[PDB]
Amino acid sequence: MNVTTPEVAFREYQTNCLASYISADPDITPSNLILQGYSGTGKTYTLKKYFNANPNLHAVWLEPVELVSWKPLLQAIARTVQYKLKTLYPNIPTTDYDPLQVEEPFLLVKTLHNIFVQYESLQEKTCLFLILDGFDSLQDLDAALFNKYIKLNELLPKDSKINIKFIYTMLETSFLQRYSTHCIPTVMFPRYNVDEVSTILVMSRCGELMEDS
Amino acid sequence: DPGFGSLQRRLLQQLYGTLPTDEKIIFTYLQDCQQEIDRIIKQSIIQKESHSVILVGPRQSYKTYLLDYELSLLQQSYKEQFITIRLNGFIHSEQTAINGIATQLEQQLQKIHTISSGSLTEVFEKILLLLDSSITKITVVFIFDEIDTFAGPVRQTLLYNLFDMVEHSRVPVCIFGCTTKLNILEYLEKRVKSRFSQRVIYMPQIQNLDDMVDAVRNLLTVRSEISPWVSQWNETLEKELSDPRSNLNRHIRMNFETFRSLPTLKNSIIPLVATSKNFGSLCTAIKSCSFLDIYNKNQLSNNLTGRLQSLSDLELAILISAARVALRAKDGSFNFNLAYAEYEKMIKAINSRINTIKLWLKKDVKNVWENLVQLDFFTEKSAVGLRDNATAAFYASNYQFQGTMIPFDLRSYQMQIILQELRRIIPKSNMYYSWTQL
Amino acid sequence: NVRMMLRRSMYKLYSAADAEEHNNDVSYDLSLVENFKRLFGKDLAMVFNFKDVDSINFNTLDNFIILLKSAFKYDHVKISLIFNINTNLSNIEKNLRQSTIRLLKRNYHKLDVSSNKGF
Amino acid sequence: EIYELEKGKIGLNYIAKVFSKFVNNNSTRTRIAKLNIQQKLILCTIIQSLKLNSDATIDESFDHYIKAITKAPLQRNEFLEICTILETCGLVSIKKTKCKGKTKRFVDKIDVDLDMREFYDEMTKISILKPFL
Amino acid sequence: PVIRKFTKKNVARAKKKYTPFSKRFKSIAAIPDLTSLPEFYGNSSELMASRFENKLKTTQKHQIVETIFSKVKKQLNSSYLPARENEFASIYLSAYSAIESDSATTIYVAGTPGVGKTLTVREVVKELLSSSAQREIPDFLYVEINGLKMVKPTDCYETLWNKVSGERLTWAASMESLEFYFKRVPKNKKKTIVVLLDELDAMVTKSQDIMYNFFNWTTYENAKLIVIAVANTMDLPERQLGNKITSRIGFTRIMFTGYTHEELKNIIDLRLKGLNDSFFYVDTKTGNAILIDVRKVRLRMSADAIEIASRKVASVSGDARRALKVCKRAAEIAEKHYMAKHGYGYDGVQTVHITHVMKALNETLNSHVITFMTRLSFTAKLFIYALLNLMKKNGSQEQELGDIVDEIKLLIEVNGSNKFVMEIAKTLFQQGSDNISEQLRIISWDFVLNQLLDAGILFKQTMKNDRICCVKLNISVEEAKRAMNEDETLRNL
Ligand SMILES: Nc1ncnc2c1ncn2[C@@H]1O[C@H](COP(=O)(O)OP(=O)(O)OP(O)(O)=S)[C@@H](O)[C@H]1O
Ligand SMILES: Nc1ncnc2c1ncn2[C@@H]1O[C@H](COP(=O)(O)OP(=O)(O)OP(O)(O)=S)[C@@H](O)[C@H]1O
Ligand SMILES: Nc1ncnc2c1ncn2[C@@H]1O[C@H](COP(=O)(O)OP(=O)(O)OP(O)(O)=S)[C@@H](O)[C@H]1O
Ligand SMILES: [Mg+2]
Ligand SMILES: [Mg+2]
Ligand SMILES: [Mg+2]
């Protein structure tokens, strides 16, 4: 690959095992990727540091804690994928589809298919990284919603130029031990150390204390 | 150098399965079951016969893999002679399955050269006059994924209509049902069983350890000569697989007794091949397997032992006291008052024998108590977790439970980790280790 | 529960934003708070007002406060919370969770509103 | 209408036909249709799977099976397909019910309809269905 | 303008009229003759189904290759008969004595699935259409109402009134229209109609009003309909319909009993009369058989194979479809043997015999759970062994998970002598390496919970506490006992 591993200070395994799973070629990239951790364990920081260290590949940042049930989640996916593609390849005729038309998972499949088959005018096949930061932080959550996002690349077309690659972010480890037989690449984030907390706080806070008037 | 990246990209493409469909590998333990699928599906795109089979096998047992291999193998020549209708049993409820078939009959017959429009009755009749009704027709291959949800114990209308256009139709159909239940024929209503061809073919599992090392040999060897290093990389692979005392064969041997699955090995091997930077580094990294114990340690880094290891001292005393109180009760329930009436008793007995432990007041043990329910060390009394379907997670979202209206320090919690399992995992050099006995 | 609070809150927000202006349909969640700056052109300053704070579930209320806390990153909002308590403050910060209490200890003010105080 | 099928003596066999058709035979045709002993003693297994448990799972009808004959193998498929004969005749009900128990997911049940008076006289000829009662 | 509380952007409404047949003319004395009307009874624009026909035909190309067994696999598809005579005669007489007498009868057939009831009913209607073409009777418009071919159980009104009248209304307007047309319109202006109610026990929904109306329009003197409703259980109006509607359905109740082995042998004999013992001119180069290099080949679909396929399927449920499925699987097995032995590939005599049809008779009598739990992992067999030996101690079938965990730990700690278990008990708890502490659960514990939960062997109740979550064996205990006795290590451990 040609990705740039970031210099995250105390997640050294995770950035190496994150550049081994996020690439610009859609063949050498998994279709689902879990980043299970706990509160404060550095998931979003190392994700943003990785995606800022690699400006070429395309991210979709979506947080299902401010989108309570599953229907605003589908509507927000179908909204922001189209909004990301509008500002990525501007010179393609992009007929705006309404994200509120999505009411079911099937209509998300149909809407995303009609969005993707209008970008065939490109040159080479790319992947778009849709990040669901906090999938267990969904408020009105059930045990069978995650099966509807695993088996979504089974429905998007195979010889297409834009392929959706998900990156989840879990937090609970009894949620993830239900989807264990699906064999999704799981990158676990263990809880920080006192010797590491004591200097994470120093590198984070001692800039805004001398600059505190 | 640009010589090593070709070998690495080819290796990761073989490990994902994203090869072109002429060097795409088929493992030897699933070469007989690929012959049966090839026989079934090759007398419906060519001979235009119609039938229905159900593929039973566990998750990640290569059912969608085999079926997509056939449908990409029956497309290099007979492209225009078939269309595919794929639908899940998760994202297609039994009312949204009709719109799925109508949207996928419309857009697939468009690409060869309005049935999607109308209400549900008009759409369901527009796709019953199309399928139930020298020249060659077009066949439809239905791919039902997780068919054990359409076979629910109420009506089974979609299965009756789909299996009914097998005998009684003029259009050749071939419908594949991938499921996971071994008792799938007990699910079907007795007039959908009579329409069914009864040809359920079970996927093969791994019977021998030789099958697993032959599968890894098939996955990691390179056939097409792209990089200069391949003439070494094959042989340095076989030196690890022929010798039954190396590290790679030992990890395959412990994979054969644990989860007996090739995709777990694939997710082990992929960040080994992808984090390496030079060919000699990759060679010694697969010689030693210096990553299949780094990764395998991280996969257990927080379940109930790698995050109890990261507990603090007051939190550990609170957890030990709570497990003592639950061990002392009858059915295993306690609360914050019964837990703090053991923390101060234990710590007063610590200061009795002797420099000490600061007793934190009950205004600060509340934060510790909340931090041990956000790590799942306590559950409530009978609180079920995530509900099974989406409606039962709605029916309870409108219910106001009694365990959340009572005050905080009277909620009758329950242990996740008993005191015997707490005894053996805390190190014996602890100042509370004697307090885990009872 | 939390979703009816969110739908009613964003419904009242979109109503009292599109009727105080003198046209599409959005979903009633915090995405409207995200793109309120580009939907209307004005900065948001919503002031919440919980009527019988002693009568709501605090388990639903701190979930709503957590769900509101993620609105901080949008640079044009200003959330203000107003709690109408008919009891003492040692019965609200006993029932809430401690992280929400430490979030509420950032710019809090008290105000005794009772016609027996100060005759 | 049955008079016209020959091309009060014949206006009686219809009721003597539709009464006997719905009735069939409680014990005379019971073993007659069963003719097979393996289609006979299993009905006694369901009779013994009622005065211990009311949630008579086909497993419980088959755990009773290898608590009676344990004295060519037999799999569960033979038992659950020979039960279809007792389904086809119109005695037994196998469908999915609530399955109360501890967990509330669906499973097969067994139930019988006729009162145990004439069936208890039906066993008076078979010398092997007398110890199983 | 307005701000809406929710949206229904994906809504699709039909084009269906609301005012019924009662308000066309509002004159009962001046209703026109409905029979020879241009739109009624399918007299105009009956190409309304054959619009989609030239979509599933592509290229007439590439010379498809039949084989010697492709003929039998085509003649064993969906298509006098010596099977149903005493039912065909009674049904055709009971439906002919109403066609000739302008009556309003109702015939009730029932049977377990496969006994040919819909075949004999459709042949009765074909023969009555032949009698109408011979003009010994008046004519009728034939309507088939399938109980499961409709998304709403009240769409029976819509499709019946559409088939009668050429106009499509909503279901309420259609039921009022059919009520008026079957009550008030006199018997000189309506030709009769016969209604097949296919799979009746799927329109009993929430009111029994559809079951009321279709059996209460036939109690009228002024309605010339004949309902030939089929069913799936003989005592259906005694179980799930009211006793008044039982009195409506009446006393006919002709049962289609199961087939016999002689009848089934005659059925397969008539299906293969044109192909058995005949001669085919195959070619050595491909295999393309042609019935009357080139080899004249017989085809002996042997009568002993036919009768040994027929006796078992005559015992179990007696279905003339499952007999065809058995005898088609036998021909499929023969064709696979033939093609693999000759290298033919798609673009002496041939036989089908007893030890060749026994594979087609054994393909549906295999429980592939024993051969699944043998090939299961060692930890999954150890899970099942811990669950199996907890049962003799407890007697509940519903053991907890904290008990299974401690029983697994008990077995591993109490067997410290066996070389196999001391080799495996290191990896079972620490994945064979240090820098990994001794885990509380064994490795692959959630994996072997889920691999049996999805497979239906295991049965866990939903709760948040994975120490008191109960777990049941959903299959059996006897087959788990007979599957745990072939391990060579769990037989002693
Ligand atoms: N390795 C690190 N180096 C520097 N700063 C860090 C590091 N880890 C954490 N931080 C800081 O601590 C914060 C932790 O927040 P996050 O990284 O978002 O953790 P988190 O798991 O996303 O929290 P959740 O899951 O959203 S509740 C970061 O925003 C940084 O400010
Ligand atoms: N179309 C495909 N192309 C390439 N690799 C695939 C494809 N489908 C599956 N795989 C890979 O094959 C392995 C398992 O295959 P699967 O087909 O997903 O197993 P499975 O039988 O589909 O599981 P199910 O559908 O839940 S029963 C994984 O490594 C997948 O990434
Ligand atoms: N005597 C027979 N002759 C020819 N085919 C028969 C005969 N009996 C049954 N069949 C087969 O059964 C099919 C007719 O369906 P039936 O079995 O009569 O309908 P049914 O009995 O109502 O089954 P269900 O439960 O409604 S799906 C035909 O396609 C035949 O192949
Ligand atoms: Mg985050
Ligand atoms: Mg699948
Ligand atoms: Mg039928």
Three-class DSSP category at E193:
strand
Taking the Cβ of residue E322 and every Cβ of chain B, the question of whether any pair is shorter than 8 Å is answered with: yes
Residue E259 and residue E314 in contact, taking contact as beta carbons nearer than 8 Å: yes
Q: E243: which 2 tokens?
A: 């006793």
> What is the crossing angle of helices A43-53 and A12-19, to 10°?
50
D: neighbours with 3+ CB pairs under 8 Å? Answer: B, E
**Main-chain dihedrals φ then ψ at residue E464, nearest 5 degrees:** -95, -10
DSSP sequence for E482-493: HHSSSSSSTTT-
Residue type, E451: Q
Q: With an 8 Å Cβ cutoff, are B407 and C1 in contact?
A: no
Distance CA B157, CA B120 (A): 14
- CB-CB under 8 Å, D105 with E459: yes
Which residues in E lie closer than 8 A to residue C15 (C-beta atoms)?
A: 3
Test E10 with A181 for CB contact under 8 angstroms: no
Q: Are strands E280-283 and E294-297 parallel, antiparallel or unpaired?
A: antiparallel
Given B366, B397, B400, which is nearest C57 (Cβ)?
B400
The shortest C-alpha distance from B153 to chain D (Å) reads 7
* H or E element in which residue E126 lies: helix E117-134
Task: Return residues 180-199 of A near B (CB < 8 Å).
Answer: 181-183, 185-194
Query: Which positions in chain C touch B367 (Cβ < 8 Å)?
Result: 98
Residue of E440, E445, E462, E488 to mutate when probing chain B, most B C-beta within 10 A: E440
In the structure encoding, which two tokens stand for residue B254, read together? 């412990």
- Which ligand places an atom closest to the C-alpha of B65? 2
Residue E336 buriedness (CB in 10 A; 0-12 / 13-18 / 19+):
middle
E141-146: strand order across its sheet: E141-146, E193-198, E225-227
Q: What is the Cβ-side half-sphere exposure of residue B332, based on CA atoms within 13 angstroms?
A: 15
Sequence positions preceding breaks in chain D, C–N over 2.5 Å = 7, 71
Beta strands E398-399 and E471-473 are: antiparallel
Closest listed residue to residue B23, CA positions, set B226, B232, B214? B226
Contact E152 B121 (CB under 8 A): yes
Q: Confirm if E120 and E87 have CB atoms less than 8 A apart.
A: yes
Q: Enumerate the residues of chain C whose CB falls inside 8 A of the CB of residue B411.
A: none
E117 C-alpha to center of ligand 3: Å? 6
| Cα dihedral sign, E174-E178-E180-E181 | positive
CA-wise closest residue to B176 among B205, B156, B196: B196
Ligand 1, CB within 6 Å, residue ranges: A 8-11, 37, 39-45, 171, 200, 203-204
B40, B78, B121, B262, best to mutate vs chain E, most E CBs in 10 Å = B121
Bridge pairing between strands E193-198 and E141-146: parallel
Cross-chain Cβ contact E450/A178 below 8 Å? yes
Q: Which amino acid, B237? A: L
**How many whole angstroms from B182 Cα to the centroid of ligand 5?**
15
Q: Is A28 in contact with B13 (Cβ distance < 8 A)?
A: yes
From A171's Cα to the closest Cα of chain C, the distance in A is: 15
**Residues of chain A with C-beta less than 8 angstroms from the C-beta of E443:** none
E85 assigned to a ligand binding site: no
A65 touches chain C (CB under 8 A): yes
**Mind listing the domains of chain A with CATH numbers?**
12-178 (3.40.50.300)
- When CB atoms are compared, the residue of C14, C23, C25 closest to E7 is C25
**Amino acid letter at E267?**
I
Residues 6+ apart with CB under 8 A from B230: B7, B222
E112 is in an annotated binding site: yes
Instruction: Output Rg (C-alpha) for chain A, integer angstroms.
Output: 18
Whole-angstrom CA distances from E200 to C42, E90, E123, E211, E214 are 63, 21, 19, 9, 11
Cα–Cα dist E127/E133, whole Å: 10
Dist. CA B62 → ligand 2 center (Å)? 5
The DSSP code sequence of E333-380 is HHHHHHHHHHT------EEE-HHHHHHHHHTTS--TTHHHHTTS-HHH
| In contact, B336 and B380? CB cutoff 8 Å | no
Length of chain B: 438
Residue C37 has φ and ψ, to the nearest 5°, of: -70, -30
D97 DSSP assignment: E
Q: Quote the longest CA-to-CA distance of chain B.
A: 101
Hey, are the CB atoms on A19 and B386 less than 8 Å from each other?
no
User: Is the separation of the CB atoms in E331 and E73 below 8 Å?
Assistant: yes
Distance CA(B305)–CA(E440), nearest Å, equals 7
The three-state (H, E, C) secondary structure of A128-197, written as one string: EEEEEECCCCCCCCCCCCCHHHHCCCCCCCCCCCEEEEEEEECCCCCCCCCCCCCCCCECCCCCCCHHHH
Residue E258 sits at the chain D interface (C-beta within 8 Å): yes
Residue E321 counted as an annotated binding residue: yes
Q: Which residues have a Cβ under 8 Å from the Cβ of A186 and sit 6 or more positions away?
A: A34, A36, A176, B267, B299
Alpha-carbon distance of A161 to A92, in angstroms, equals: 13
Query: Using an 8 Å Cβ cutoff, are D59 and D80 in contact?
Result: no
E250 is in an annotated binding site: no
From C67, C54, C62, select the one nearest C7 (Cα to Cα). Answer: C67
E contacts of B115 (beta carbons < 8 Å)? 52
Interface touch A79/C26, C-beta < 8 Å: no
Q: Is the distance from CB of B127 to CB of B105 less than 8 angstroms?
A: yes
Q: Report how far apart, in Å, the C-alpha atoms of A105 and of each of A131, B107, B364 are.
A: 18, 18, 46
DSSP C44-108: ---B--BS-TTTS-HHHHHHHHHHHHGGGGGSS---B--B--SS-GGGTTTTS-HHHHHHTTSS-
> Could you tell me if D106 and B153 are in contact, meaning their C-beta atoms sit under 8 angstroms apart?
yes
What's the distance, Cα to Cα, between the start and end of chain C in Å? 40
Q: Using the 8-state DSSP alphabet, how is residue A97 labeled?
A: P
Environment class of E93 (CB within 10 Å of its CB; exposed 0-12, middle 13-18, buried 19+):
middle
DSSP string for E216-250: HSTT-SS--EEE----SSTTHHHHTS-HHHHHHH-
Tokens 């005759």 appear where?
C119
Cβ neighbours, 10 Å, residue E85: 11
Q: Using CA atoms, how far apart are residues A201 and A190, in angstroms rounded to an integer?
A: 18
D111-125: burial string, b at 16+ Cβ within 10 Å, e else: ebeeeeeebeebbee
Residue E285: partners with Cβ closer than 8 Å, 6 or more residues away: E293
Rounded alpha-carbon distances, angstroms, from residue B26 to B64, B72, B256, E6, E291:
13, 14, 19, 51, 40
β-pair type (E109-110, B378-379): unpaired
Report whether A117 contacts A157 (CB < 8 A). Answer: yes
Residue tagged 């019935």 (tokens):
E291
3-state secondary structure chain B: CCCHHHHHHHHHHHHHCCCCCCCCCCCHHHCHHHHHHHHHHHCCCCCCCCEEEEEECCCCCCCHHHHHHHHHHCCCCCCCCEEEEEECCCCCCCCHHHHHHHHHHHHHHHHHCCCCCCCHHHHHHHCCCCCCCCCCECEEEEEEECCCCCCCCCCCHHHHHHHHHHHCCCCCEEEEEEECCCCCCCCCCHHHHCCCCCEEEECCCCCCHHHHHHHHHHHHCCCCCCCCCHHHHHHHHHHHHHCCCCHHHHHHHHHHHCCCCHHHHHHHHHHHHHHCCCHHHHHHHHHHCCCCCHHHHHCCCCCCCCCCCCCCHHHHHHHHHHHHHHHHCCCCEECHHHHHHHHHHHHHHHHHCCCCCCCCCCCCHHHHHHHCCCCCCEECCCCCCCCCCCCHHHHCCCCCCHHHCCCHHHCCEEECCCHHHHHCCCCCCCCCHHHHCC
- Measured CA distances, E314 to C88, D68, E256, E272 (Å): 81, 28, 14, 19
Among all bound ligands, the one having the nearest atom to the CA of B160 is 3
* DSSP result, D10-35: SSSTTHHHHHHHHH--SSHHHHHHH-
- Cα separation of the two ends of chain D: 45
Q: Which of the listed residues A204, A205, A208 should we mutate to test ligand 1's pocket, taking the one with most ligand atoms within 8 A of CB?
A: A204
Count the neighbouring beta carbons within 10 Å of the beta carbon of residue B264.
Answer: 19
The neighbouring-strand residues paired with A129 are A59, A165
> Given B191, B417, B418, which is nearest E113 (Cβ)?
B191
Strand partners, E399: E471
Task: Name the residue type at position E89.
Answer: A
Cβ-nearest to A180 among E7, E446, E466 = E446
Name the residue type at position B316: L
Quick check: D85 contacting B, CB < 8 Å?
A: no
Separation CA B305–CA B320 (nearest Å): 14
* Touch test A–B: 3 Cβ pairs or more under 8 Å: yes
User: Checking DSSP bridges between strand E254-255 and strand E109-110, what pairing results, if any?
Assistant: parallel
Q: Residue B375, Cβ neighbours under 10 Å: how many?
A: 21
Parallel, antiparallel, or unpaired for β E299-301 and E350-352? parallel
- Binding annotation of A for ATP: 37-44
Which chain A residue shows the shortest CA-CA distance from C60?
Answer: A139
With contact defined as 3+ CB pairs under 8 Å, the chains touching A are B, C, E
Q: Is E7 helix (H, G, I), strand (E, B) or coil?
A: coil
Give distance in angstroms: CA of B64 to centre of ligand 5: 5
Instruction: Calculate how far, in angstroms, residue C107's C-alpha sits from the geometric centre of ligand 1.
Output: 24
Contacts of D108 in chain B (CB under 8 A): 186
Nearest-CA neighbor of B357 among B368, B349, B366?
B349
Residue type, E213: N
Which tokens in the block code for residue E360? Answer: 């087609």
Torsion angle (degrees, nearest 10) of CA A60, A66, A71, A74:
0
Residue entry with tokens 């979202």: B397
Are D109 and D44 in contact by the 8 Å Cβ rule? The answer is no
Contact D63 E478 (CB under 8 A): yes
Provide the residue type at A192 as one letter.
Y
**Would you call E281 helix, strand, or coil by DSSP?**
strand
CB B306 within 8 Å of CB A52? no
From the candidates B336, B366, B375, B399, which should be mutated to test the interface with C, based on the most C CB atoms within 10 A? B366
Q: Chain B residue closest to E435 (CA)? A: B297
Report residue E149: phi and psi, to 5°. -90, 25
Strands D107-108, E254-255: pairing is unpaired
CA–CA dist D41, D125 (Å, integer): 13
Q: Whose CA is nearest to atom 8 of ligand 3?
A: E116
**Torsion over CA: A129, A134, A135, A140 (sign):** negative
Question: What distance in Å separates the CA atoms of residue B396 and residue C107, rounded to the nearest whole number?
Answer: 35
E146 to B166, D114, E160, E200, E227: CA distances (angstroms): 17, 33, 11, 8, 13
Among B87, B64, B223, B221, CA closest to B149: B87
